Amino acid sequence: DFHRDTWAEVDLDAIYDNVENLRRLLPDDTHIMAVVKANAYGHGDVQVARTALEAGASRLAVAFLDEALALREKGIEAPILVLGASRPADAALAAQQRIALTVFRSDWLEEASALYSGPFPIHFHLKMDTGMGRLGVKDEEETKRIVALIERHPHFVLEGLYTHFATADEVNTDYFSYQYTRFLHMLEWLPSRPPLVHCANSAASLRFPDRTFNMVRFGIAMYGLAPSPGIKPLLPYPLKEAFSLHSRLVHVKKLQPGEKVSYGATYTAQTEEWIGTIPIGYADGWLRRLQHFHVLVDGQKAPIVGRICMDQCMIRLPGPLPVGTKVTLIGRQGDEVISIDDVARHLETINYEVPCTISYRVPRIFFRHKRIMEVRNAI
Amino acid sequence: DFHRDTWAEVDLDAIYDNVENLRRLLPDDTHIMAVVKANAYGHGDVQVARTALEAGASRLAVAFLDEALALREKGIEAPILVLGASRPADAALAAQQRIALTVFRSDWLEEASALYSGPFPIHFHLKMDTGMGRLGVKDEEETKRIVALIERHPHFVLEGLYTHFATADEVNTDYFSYQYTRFLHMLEWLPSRPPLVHCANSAASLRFPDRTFNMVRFGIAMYGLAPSPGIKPLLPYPLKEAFSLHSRLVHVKKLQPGEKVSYGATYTAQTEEWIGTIPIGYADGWLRRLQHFHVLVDGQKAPIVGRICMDQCMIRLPGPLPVGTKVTLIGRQGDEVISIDDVARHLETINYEVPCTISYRVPRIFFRHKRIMEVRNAI
Numbered sequence: 109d110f111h112r113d114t115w116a117e118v119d120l121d122a123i124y125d126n127v128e129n130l131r132r133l134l135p136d137d138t139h140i141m142a143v144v145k146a147n148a149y150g151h152g153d154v155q156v157a158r159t160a161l162e163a164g165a166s167r168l169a170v171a172f173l174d175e176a177l178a179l180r181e182k183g184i185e186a187p188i189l190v191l192g193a194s195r196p197a198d199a200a201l202a203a204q205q206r207i208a209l210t211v212f213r214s215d216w217l218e219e220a221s222a223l224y225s226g227p228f229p230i231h232f233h234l235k236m237d238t239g240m241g242r243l244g245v246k247d248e249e250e251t252k253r254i255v256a257l258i259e260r261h262p263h264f265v266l267e268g269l270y271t272h273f274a275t276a277d278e279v280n281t282d283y284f285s286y287q288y289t290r291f292l293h294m295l296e297w298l299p300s301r302p303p304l305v306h307c308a309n310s311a312a313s314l315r316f317p318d319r320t321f322n323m324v325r326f327g328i329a330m331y332g333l334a335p336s337p338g339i340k341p342l343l344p345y346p347l348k349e350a351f352s353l354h355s356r357l358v359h360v361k362k363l364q365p366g367e368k369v370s371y372g373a374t375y376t377a378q379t380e381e382w383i384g385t386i387p388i389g390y391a392d393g394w395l396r397r398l399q400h401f402h403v404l405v406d407g408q409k410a411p412i413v414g415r416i417c418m419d420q421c422m423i424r425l426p427g428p429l430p431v432g433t434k435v436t437l438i439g440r441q442g443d444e445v446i447s448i449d450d451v452a453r454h455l456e457t458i459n460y461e462v463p464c465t466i467s468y469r470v471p472r473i474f475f476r477h478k479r480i481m482e483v484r485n486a487i
Numbered sequence: 488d489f490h491r492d493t494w495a496e497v498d499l500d501a502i503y504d505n506v507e508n509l510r511r512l513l514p515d516d517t518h519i520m521a522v523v524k525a526n527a528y529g530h531g532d533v534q535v536a537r538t539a540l541e542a543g544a545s546r547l548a549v550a551f552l553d554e555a556l557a558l559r560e561k562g563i564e565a566p567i568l569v570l571g572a573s574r575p576a577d578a579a580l581a582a583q584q585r586i587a588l589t590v591f592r593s594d595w596l597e598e599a600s601a602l603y604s605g606p607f608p609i610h611f612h613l614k615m616d617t618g619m620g621r622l623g624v625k626d627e628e629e630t631k632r633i634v635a636l637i638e639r640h641p642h643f644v645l646e647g648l649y650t651h652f653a654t655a656d657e658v659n660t661d662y663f664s665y666q667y668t669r670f671l672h673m674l675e676w677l678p679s680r681p682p683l684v685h686c687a688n689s690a691a692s693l694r695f696p697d698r699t700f701n702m703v704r705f706g707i708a709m710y711g712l713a714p715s716p717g718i719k720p721l722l723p724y725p726l727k728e729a730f731s732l733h734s735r736l737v738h739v740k741k742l743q744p745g746e747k748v749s750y751g752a753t754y755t756a757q758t759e760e761w762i763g764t765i766p767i768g769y770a771d772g773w774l775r776r777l778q779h780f781h782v783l784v785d786g787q788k789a790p791i792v793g794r795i796c797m798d799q800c801m802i803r804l805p806g807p808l809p810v811g812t813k814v815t816l817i818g819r820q821g822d823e824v825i826s827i828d829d830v831a832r833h834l835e836t837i838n839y840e841v842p843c844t845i846s847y848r849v850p851r852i853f854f855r856h857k858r859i860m861e862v863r864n865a866i
């Protein structure tokens with residue numbers, strides 16, 4: 109239940125299709141690892157994880173331990189890999205919750221070894237830095253050492269090893285190739301190929317599906333968003349956008365010329381205008397930078413006038429509309445549509461950041477099989 | 488507890504002091520309503536509310552119904568006012584939970600009257616628009632109609648009436664004076680005066696404590712943040728900033744000239760540099776626009792290098808530092824300090840928006856009497 113007329117809608121049918129289409133494109137030996145970090149990119153962790161698994165994914169990935177434990181608590185029983193770092197003293201916790209960990213330092217293992225002695229086995233995924241410069245091992249003696257410590261511990265298992273690309277969404281493939289080639293060279297530092305070798309993100313897997321090894325880490329595209337605009341025309345199938353955001357007019361009034369609106373009085377009515385107030389502001393992730401952006405109301409675009417407030421903002425209406433009238437900030441209304449890509453453009457950022465920013469304050473309504481399936485209200 | 492080395496700290500002692508000083512500043516007959524909307528501006532709703540009431544506040548204010556219900560659930564018994572809009576159907580729930588509502592339309596009351604009929608009383612606070620252009624009544628007849636509908640319903644009660652300033656934080660008081668005077672004029676439209684008349688936010692009450700009537704709505708300054716830059720030297724007492732944000736190096740490494748860092752490979756090491764990786768990214772509220780900013784490490788400024796990722800970012804270190812070295816994003820490390828205003832400047836926004844954007848993903852550690860009081864991990 110929610111008591112403010114502002115909410116996001118998440119179409120799980122769209123997410124289902126985005127994953128199934130990829131399942132249809134990959135070799136039947138290749139696993140799809142659904143990346144669901146950051147509450148599924150602001151779409152809802154368990155709701156997306158479930159749908160993805162139903163569509164063909166066999167594993168899930170999160171950013172840090174807390175995100176994995178939360179999925180376990182909500183009943184997800186499929187394998188989960190923590191992509192980022194964790195504390196050596198937390199290995200036992202991840203072990204008994206059947207959570208796989210990313211490893212990239214030999215001193216971490218030495219510490220973990222002194223802290224853990226079974227009985228649950230711990231599955232590690234070795235990260236190799238091939239040119240992203242974030243996480244990962246970079247030299248032979250380190251890789252060999254990490255492997256040695258793993259092989260020597262009765263409850264440490266090297267389940268996989270992977271790398272991440274810095275430029276897989278760029279039309280130019282020069283740095284990509286260097287990373288790919290660097291990866292192939294480093295894989296030779298291992299005495300034997302672990303069961304899971306992975307390297308592809310949304311861009312790499314949809315662009316070069318044959319050179320993705322045995323596991324793909326599917327993220328941004330699962331949500332229906334293109335990794336980048338320069339890669340959109342090169343996409344194998346149409347992506348279906350899943351996120352939409354709506355509100356309703358809670359007040360309508362007519363301003364006389366010379367009348368001002370909001371903080372600092374930076375907006376002045378030049379004529380007799382109709383102004384509508386909506387219950388969404390920057391504490392909801394609708395950042396102040398979005399002043400001047402246009403929202404949809406009654407099938408028409410209306411500009412956000414005056415400064416955006418913490419919980420509210422105003423728009424110049426086409427004419428006098430009734431209170432309760434639906435306002436679409438992201439999504440479709442009749443002939444007009446506003447995409448997350450349109451919002452990112454205005455905020456001078458990339459689509460990834462947008463749904464992530466729509467805060468915990470905004471409830472998520474899920475659709476599946478073309479029917480309302482669940483409402484998630486964080487507070 | 489939490490299992491990622493990235494956390495925010497809220498000093499409840501600072502908050503206590505900011506409110507206590509206001510209690511001494513205002514005439515003993517003027518009440519303090521602490522504004523804790525947006526999860527207490529990202530500081531923690533119940534933790535701040537409790538401290539504020541301990542320091543001298545007697546009432547609380549939130550943005551919408553869900554926020555007020557959550558406080559009641561967390562054990563808060565103090566009067567709570569919902570500043571924004573709500574549904575007429577929800578009038579009964581608010582009444583049963585002892586939650587005062589803001590009203591500014593007669594058609595809303597028309598609807599709530601037919602849906603509600605006792606036995607609990609609903610206390611209303613009539614909102615008057617005097618120049619902000621957000622919410623509020625603007626003419627005499629509507630004002631009288633509203634009062635009349637409230638008058639004839641046995642369980643509807645007009646507990647207060649108020650307005651809000653658009654420029655109380657601007658050194659120039661031209662518009663402020665206009666609004667203040669307009670409020671006084673509109674007050675005469677009411678047959679009798681409700682027990683509570685309020686108009687002041689943080690800026691208005693810190694600057695003109697004598698023109699605040701009987702209740703003040705203290706927000707931003709409660710958190711130790713100046714309402715505006717220009718109003719800073721005009722502040723009666725020193726504000727104590729309550730919010731700090733920290734992390735730790737999870738990876739340290741040396742790059743060779745020519746190696747690139749992060750997405751797009753936009754950064755190239757020009758010489759042999761030590762790069763540190765910390766576990767915080769834009770999904771944590773540390774927006775991509777903070778790309779050219781810095782963080783504190785070992786009492787020294789370290790610039791972020793390359794693009795910021797969803798859950799991690801890299802920085803150039805002064806040299807080889809041990810993994811686990813504390814990094815401060817907002818706060819003081821020795822002689823250096825990074826305030827929210829500094830971050831706000833680089834993000835090109837106001838200090839208000841910063842703590843609100845630090846997402847649900849980041850745990851809040853509360854300090855009281857210089858001791859850790861609680862840890863709040865939303866996931």
Ligand SMILES: *Cc1c(COP(=O)(O)O)cnc(C)c1O
Pocket residue numbers: 143145191272308309310311325326327328329335797
């Ligand atoms: C977040 C993440 C992904 C997913 O990337 P997309 O660009 O959204 O496909 C893949 N791999 C790793 C290592 C990640 O951290």
Ligand SMILES: *Cc1c(COP(=O)(O)O)cnc(C)c1O
Pocket residue numbers: 418522524570651687688689690704705706707708714
């Ligand atoms: C948010 C809010 C406040 C608090 O304002 P500060 O600038 O944080 O003091 C006061 N009154 C209203 C109506 C508010 O919306």
